Every structure is written in structure tokens, then in C-alpha cells.
């Protein structure tokens, strides 16, 4: 599924991401935009052999098990397939655990390079929330 901007903003808000551990809703929408372009079925095989899955491109080397990555720590205790659903519940729950680490949202390269430092709240502007 390819989310519409305000559609995703509302979903993420319902899923408790607005101001989760200090990160305003706009941060999450922006991250989803630059990581997957709002596409829940996005998958990108990394060089090291791991794969990024879902709307927030969560990597299989540490966060989920795709049963094909030798390292796989599966910290979110979930099959990576669960991150490819049109139901973002699994991705959000995993993202919350990820961001709860010391690195926070820096775990996402796209956010670090395209969102951090900008007016991220622009990403939810014009949306009824």
C-alpha cells in the first residue's frame, strides 16, 4: 500500500507516534517519506546481505527475522514479513522500540539526512488531526 500523506499522518497519530519520546508527528511522516516514499511493501537488499522492510525500512540484521540473514538478532521479535502489511501496527511497534534506544531517530539514515534540521512539522500541515 502507498499511503497518502494526511492518511498516514492520521494513522501514525492514532498509533501514538506524535511526540513519542520527544519526536513530533512530522518527524515520523518525513522519515516514512524518505525511507520508502509511503510504500508499505518497500524492500531494499543491503550490501551486507541484510534487507530493509516496510514503510520505515526496518533492517533484518538487527530488528526482524527474514530467515535469510545470518546475523539476525530479531530484536523486535517478529518475522520481517509482518512489516510489509498495509496494517502499520507491526512497523510502528518495532519503530518505537528502535527509537527507544540511545540513538533515537538517528537509526534512520533518511531522517538523519533529509528530516533532521528542517521544518518537519510541514509534513502534517494541512491535515485534519
Amino acid at each position, epitope marked *: 500500500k502507498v499511503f497518502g500523506r494526511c492518511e498516514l499522518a492520521a494513522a501514525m*497519530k*492514532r*498509533h*501514538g*507516534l*506524535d*511526540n*513519542y*519520546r*520527544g519526536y513530533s508527528l512530522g518527524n515520523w511522516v518525513c522519515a516514512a517519506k524518505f525511507e520508502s516514499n509511503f510504500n508499505t511493501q518497500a524492500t531494499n537488499r543491503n550490501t551486507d546481505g541484510s534487507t530493509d522492510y516496510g514503510i520505515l525500512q526496518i533492517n533484518s540484521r*538487527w530488528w526482524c527475522n527474514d530467515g535469510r540473514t545470518p546475523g539476525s*538478532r*530479531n*530484536l523486535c*521479535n517478529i518475522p520481517c514479513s509482518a512489516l510489509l502489511s498495509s496494517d502499520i*501496527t507491526a512497523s510502528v*511497534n518495532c519503530a*518505537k*522500540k528502535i527509537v*527507544s*534506544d*540511545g*540513538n533515537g531517530m538517528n537509526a534512520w539514515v533518511a531522517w538523519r539526512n533529509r528530516c533532521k534540521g528542517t521544518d518537519v512539522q510541514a509534513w502534517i500541515r494541512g491535515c485534519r488531526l
Partner: antibody
Amino acid sequence: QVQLQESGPGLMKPSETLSLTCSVSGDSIRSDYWSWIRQPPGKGLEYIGYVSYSGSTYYNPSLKSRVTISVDTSKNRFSLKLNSVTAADTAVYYCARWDGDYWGQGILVTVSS
Amino acid sequence: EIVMTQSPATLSVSPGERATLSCRASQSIGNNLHWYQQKPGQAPRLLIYYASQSISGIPARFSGSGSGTEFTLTISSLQSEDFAVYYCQQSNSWPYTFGGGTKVEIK
């Protein structure tokens, strides 16, 4: 089938350092986030802090930088250290997996002046 | 820190009755609210996570609802083994905080 078990001294004197450990079975200590929570007698629950996969820690400001949480990957367990204890620290101490799915059974630590 | 307030402090329930427990947050916490059940001499047991998500093995009579600053735990038809102290806990902001608890006891 995951099991957490707290261990350590159940009695101590004021000003001393409280030291507890939580051993895990059925899960890898190096593969998750781990927490400590306490419950003073007849009172509610107070979150002490947690350590994440990268080793980063988060401590409750109410403890005034007196707390340390560390991981011993070699023995699949993590510990809690609380310096300069007083009667206010008497409580049942619990360890749990960060997501909350599994908790230890708790260990009573009494600071008897 | 976010202050969590539960009500009532004590809830008398007759076996078979519907039980409604309330938990409010001093500020919005989205759906980042978890419910725990604690029986005497036992550790708290997670029943509901992220306000309404159910946990495998937990009876269907337990249901969580609410968002923002007002949350509710409903036991559709309380059974005798449900008597215990229930706590809510928010995870939206560090330090994580627990409500003061609601002691559910037989009537």
C-alpha cells in the same frame, strides 16, 4: 518460555551500595532491552531504568544519579547498582524485559538502619 | 514526568459483574498506555499493551480502550480470580510512570 530471576542481598545498612542481578533463561540478554522496577512496601510501582541493545541507559531522575544498570553477556544476565541507600530504598525490586512480557518474581531488599 | 492517575482507588465487584477501571495522563500519551494485573506476592503481569492490543493467553473479558489522556480497562464479566491490583503505565515519555493503582476486590 522465558524466565527472569533476581538475586542479591535482601538486607543492608544505610549508605551502602545495593547490588542486584537478574539472570535470564530462554532468551538472549544481548538480544533485547532490559529493565528494573521497584515497589516500596504497601506502595505502587516506580520505574528505575532500562538498558537497550546498544548499551545506552535511561535512569529515573528520582534516583538522583545513584543508579547503574549493566549487562554481563557472558553470563546472560544484567545488574542494578544503587549507591547511598536509605530507608526510602526499601522495596521489592523487579527485573523485566523492556516490552513488559516477562518479569522476574521480585526480591525484597530491606535497608535496616 | 507525566503523572498517571487511576480511579477509583478501590473497586468492589461481585463475581459476574462488569468492571470499569479508569486511568488518565497529565498530558497526551497517544496510545502508549499499558495495563498490568498484580496479585499478592506476585509480579505485575501485562494484560493489555498500547492501550488496546491484546496479549496471547489473556482472557477475552479483558479489554482496553481510550487515547490521548483518558484510558479505560473493562472486565466484561469479572471472575473471582480477577481480584488484584491493576496498574496503568505510560511509555510515551521517560521516565516511564505508573498510575497509583486500582484495587479490585470482591463484593
